[PDB]
Write a protein that binds this ligand. Structure first.
Ligand SMILES: O=c1[nH]c2cc(C(F)(F)F)c(N3CCOCC3)cc2n(CP(=O)(O)O)c1=O
Lengths: 489, 49, 147
């Protein structure tokens, strides 16, 4: 009723540790307790991960909430794989089927492949990050064969901190010589802020250069630098602030302290920190559902010798793991619903853009239905397709021989049709042909003063131009303004 | 700064900082853009005094 | 990790041994912290890990020089992700400069019931794009399965 959990936060994770220390209390019912033994460490070093995995094995925790990186994912999943100790995290959506390791970060690898098909690209450049792993690089190369892409994947994660200024400039100058006006930037947050600065200084954020910040939390950066440039910058978020749980949370979040929760006053949450809040929700909703079926998961003075030969389990195994992988909570990420493995089912990665106004939303990606375009369809902004009213009288516009085969502004041909296509290039517009009903080029009526035919439709309202053989006469010049004549009959 | 944020320092946009002391500013912002920025100085540092 | 500390509980002075890509990070961290020299004929690590003594020298450059001798730009670089992606990261960085069109297929995680289906889906999806210059990149057990 006061379950001991571990939790291996990194050495530089402050806002991540905040939403853990936050979400611990504003979610907890005072019945249960979630006693931590948080150990900060440099997780790129499998030595200190190993110590802190067994230090929290000596004390006998029932779950560890650590952040692994590329150089330690093979440490965490191995130790947790053998010793059956459950593990929950918002880090990497692990390559493969590692048991006892719960990935709470959604699987981006499908959403990036869906988005590109919407923009219909073939000519990327895929600036990626070596230290953050390559599982997405083996999904836009392995699937580049089928859909004839020309990925130009350049590793940018080895750049030194003194040759930063020179190499990023020489990077895009290389991409300029291939004329790659499309980049699909892939790094984590601090390298996106360092690329976007080095895009601006060499002036690559003008109209043309599309970007895709392939990072789960698109608005977590410094977007008010390339917002006003002119470069369409798409993106990916999971914490969509126009919803119930977020708006309730962000009110609490924006009122917090500066020194009780470091980096919490800001009205935007990091997705690494955001899932950590949604973790604590999962990290008891299993365990309180476990107490609904009366499973005493208790243990003894567990030997602080992980490296025991032989290596027995802690007992009871899957009993925790069953509880974790059934939890259908609703958190500030969407439907947190796992599988038999630890990857998330039924989440709501929603695709954003970056208009001048701000980070607009344009719909979502979600496993069942691929790309839903729930956007404002009222953003038409059209160049109204004018009603070019025209008689049908050869050698002018005549009806083509396949007159029941195709439809609209390709059906008619003649002198007027090639005139309309040539006038549209100069007077730039769009047009859709319209044959008048009765014929009758122009005639004012005897007493009712109702015009007839093409004058009747040009005058009143249902036309905008009359590309047709109308003779310029006096009684048609008063009501309609002609153009200087194109033919002298 | 407000030229850079709207991206008007690419190749083409010539400037003339008509201010007597051209290098007294923050020129390492549009140096690498591509816009030829001329200028005027009086204190030329390649001299004796 | 078990066996390394069993060797550390004897106070060894040079450890011979192999490592996969799933154990490269465990060894080069332990031998870097606990300063115990580690001699290995496995794939060399990317980067500058101290206290490992690597002896499979380097393919990474020879593969880049052999291609230049044949003058290619139409590869089909079938890689096995069980030995390090470090060679794939070389012939993609060097695919920028020398104008190449690598079509790197992961021929790695493939089970045995689809061995006569995935490969016969694979090569047809190279032949449909007419790739003729495959750069098979596997360890011997997987090379003979492709051949
Ligand atoms: O603006 C007018 N333009 C016209 C153009 C043509 C054509 F030559 F087909 F282009 C003709 N035709 C003449 C030969 O018989 C078929 C129709 C009539 C026209 N009329 C009626 P109008 O009073 O008899 O001139 C107009 O009023």
């Amino acid at each position: 009723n006061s379950i001991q959990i571990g939790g291996l936060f990194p050495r530089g994770a402050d806002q991540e540790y905040s939403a853990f220390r936050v979400g611990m209390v504003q979610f907890s019912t005072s019945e249960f307790r979630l006693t931590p033994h948080i150990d900060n460490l440099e997780v790129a070093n499998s030595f200190a991960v190993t110590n802190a995995f067994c230090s929290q094995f000596s004390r006998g925790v029932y779950a560890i909430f650590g952040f692994y990186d590329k150089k330690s994912v093979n440490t965490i999943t191995s130790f947790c794989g053998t010793l059956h100790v459950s593990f929950i995290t918002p880090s990497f959506p692990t390559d493969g089927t590692h048991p006892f390791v719960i990935q709470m970060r959604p699987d981006l690898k499908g959403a990036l492949l869906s988005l590109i098909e919407y923009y219909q690209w073939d000519k990327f450049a895929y600036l990626y990050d070596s230290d953050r792993g390559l599982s997405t690089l083996q999904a836009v190369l392995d699937s580049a064969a089928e859909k004839k892409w020309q990925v130009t994947a350049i590793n940018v994660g080895n750049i030194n901190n003194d040759k930063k200024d020179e190499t990023y400039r020489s990077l895009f100058q290389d991409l300029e010589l291939k004329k790659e006006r499309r980049v699909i930037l892939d790094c984590e947050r601090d390298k996106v802020n360092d690329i976007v600065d080095q895009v601006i200084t060499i002036g690559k954020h003008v109209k043309g250069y599309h970007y895709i910040i392939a990072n789960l939390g698109f608005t977590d950066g410094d977007l008010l630098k390339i917002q006003f440039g002119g470069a369409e910058v798409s993106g990916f978020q999971i914490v969509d602030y126009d919803d119930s749980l977020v708006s309730k949370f962000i009110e609490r979040w924006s009122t917090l302290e500066e020194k009780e929760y470091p980096g919490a006053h800001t009205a935007t949450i990091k997705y690494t920190s955001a899932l950590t809040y949604d973790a604590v929700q999962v990290m008891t909703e299993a365990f309180r559902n476990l107490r609904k079926q009366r499973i005493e998961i208790s243990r003894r003075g567990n030997a602080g010798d992980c490296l025991a030969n032989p290596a027995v389990p802690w007992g009871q195994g899957v009993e925790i793991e069953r509880a974790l992988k059934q939890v259908q909570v609703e958190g500030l990420s969407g439907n947190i619903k796992f599988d038999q493995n630890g990857k998330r089912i039924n989440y709501t990665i929603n695709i954003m853009e970056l208009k001048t106004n701000g980070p607009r939303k344009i719909g979502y990606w979600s496993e069942v239905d691929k790309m839903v375009l729930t956007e404002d369809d009222t953003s038409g902004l059209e160049q109204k397709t004018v009603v070019v009213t025209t008689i049908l009288e050869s050698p002018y516009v005549m009806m083509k021989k396949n007159h029941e085969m195709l439809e609209g502004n390709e059906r008619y041909e003649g002198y007027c049709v090639d005139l309309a296509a040539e006038i549209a290039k100069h007077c730039g517009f769009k047009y859709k042909l319209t044959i008048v009903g009765d014929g009758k080029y122009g005639a004012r009526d005897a007493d009712t003063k109702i015009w007839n035919g093409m004058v009747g439709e040009l005058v009143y309202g249902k036309a905008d131009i009359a590309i047709a053989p109308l003779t310029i006469t006096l009684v048609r010049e008063e009501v309609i303004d002609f153009s200087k004549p194109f033919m002298s009959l």
